[PDB]
Structure formats: C-alpha cells, structure tokens
Amino acid sequence: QIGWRREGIKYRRNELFLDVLESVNLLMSPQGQVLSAHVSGRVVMKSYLSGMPECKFGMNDKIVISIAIDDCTFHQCVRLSKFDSERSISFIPPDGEFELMRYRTTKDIILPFRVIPLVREVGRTKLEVKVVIKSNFKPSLLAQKIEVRIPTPLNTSGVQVICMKGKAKYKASENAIVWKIKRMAGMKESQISAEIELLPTNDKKKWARPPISMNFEVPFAPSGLKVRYLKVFEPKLNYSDHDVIKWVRYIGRSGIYETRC
C-alpha cells in the first residue's frame, strides 16, 4: 500500500548507502570577520534493500523544528518518529536512489578555508597582491579541487604571478588571476603573489573590487551534522541493519565562498 515502493523487491545483497552533501557559503571581510555564512545540505540515499524495510535515521542536530537546523524539507516517504522525535525520522524508502531531505544551517559552521588578502596600490600604475590561504580542518584530511579567483581592474595592462603551490594563470578576458591546487591538507597555508600593471586611464573613479572567490571540496560536512544511527528492520524477511552493508559519507563543497579584498 506504498505509492513509492513496489512489493517483491529482492536483492542478493542488502545494502544502504547515505551521502550527506553540503555546500558551505561564506562572505568574509578582509580582516577575517564572518559577515554571513550558511550551509545548504541534502541527504541522498541509495537503497538496495529486499522487501519493505522500515528505516530510522537519527542525527546529532535537531532536524525536526545539538544545534538546530534552520529549515528542513523531507521526501514524501518520511514520517516523524515517535521517539527521539526532534533528531530522527522514519520511513520505508523508495528503491534505488532518492533524496531523503534538504536543509540549511547557520550556526557553528566549520569554515574550511580562510583567505587573507593584501592588495596595495603603488602609485597609479601598480598593484601588489599577496593572497594567503589557510586550511582549517584536520591535518590528516585533504581538500581537493581548490580554485582561488583574484579579480583585476579593467585598466589592467599586465600581470606577473607566482604561486607557491599549484598552478596559476592570468585570464585577461575574465579580469581574474585563477589559481588551482589539486590537493591540500588541513592546518596548512599557501600563498600567491602578483604584480598588476595599470594604464593611466584617468577620468575614472576608484576600482570597486569584486571579492576573491574560492572553490573547493572537503571530505566532511561543514555544518557539523553527524549521523548518530541508521536503523533498518524487515520483520517478514527477518533482517536488520546489522545484516545490511551500510556506507555513510560526508561530502562538503564550496557554494559562494567570497572574501572581500
């Protein structure tokens, strides 16, 4: 009697995979003040379970109105739990892959990187740029696919750049220095230096600097959300989550991650 799951599903091997997928968003001042930050998250499940399994998902945070999650929406299969009703939900899942819930958090976010900019005018013909990035997570974890984008003014005539890790180039048509790093461990720093030559191009006003933007991926959930339990029970087939191959992953990525310069 379940609209989203047929009867008779059978798998040789019962498996349940869960990905906590998060985008961390930040606006930060040149001096490191958090002006705004939030996480937008979703939980994607891949269910290869026989029969009509009854599943219970509990987290460390209150996800049903231990920080609270500002807002949360749930797949149609999700029901409120009679017990631990603020941190957990219950459901018979659809078969295969589906999105179990989406959410937003704003408090106690782990900011994986700090960008520290230095953009000093030298006369009217030159900008000296140094940007330091600091990774703020466990040293045994690696961020990957890191990109830093540093804007240049429209009167830019030339750029010289040297990065200490990864690779960088000036994309003149985009007025940006693009700095890419394949991997970086936690509690590290790296930096890039550039000299930007400017045309006189007087008769204009001051340069309204876009922020420095970052992209990255991190192997954790910046919200701090943690799965406390993932229960499965099928009384007719008589198996439970300890007969199921389970896998819980936490995957973080930048959303809009911007630092004023």
Numbering used by the authors: 158 to 222, 240 to 435
Quote what the paper states about this structure.
Proper operation of the pivotal CME cargo adaptor AP2 requires membrane-localized Fer/Cip4 homology domain-only proteins (FCHO). The AP2 complex, composed of α, β2, μ2, and σ2 subunits, is pivotal to mammalian CCV formation, and its deletion is embryonically lethal in mice. FCHO1 and FCHO2 are similar in overall domain arrangement —folded N-terminal acidic phospholipid-binding homodimerization F-BAR domains and C-terminal folded μ-homology domains (μHD) separated by a ~300-residue, low-complexity intrinsically disordered protein linker, which has been suggested to participate in AP2 activation, although how it does so is undetermined. We dissect the network of interactions between the FCHO interdomain linker and AP2, which concentrates, orients, tethers, and partially destabilizes closed AP2 at the plasma membrane.
To confirm the identity of the extra, Cμ2-proximal electron density as the N terminus of FCHO2 linker, chimeras of Cμ2 alone with N1+N2 attached to the C terminus via 30-residue unstructured synthetic glycine-, serine-, and alanine-rich flexible linkers were then created, crystallized, and their structures solved at resolutions varying from 2.0 to 2.6 Å by MR using an unliganded version of Cμ2 as a search model. Crystals of a complex of Cμ2 and a peptide corresponding to this WxxL signal were grown, diffracted to 1.7-Å resolution, and were solved by MR using 1.9-Å unliganded Cμ2 as a search model.
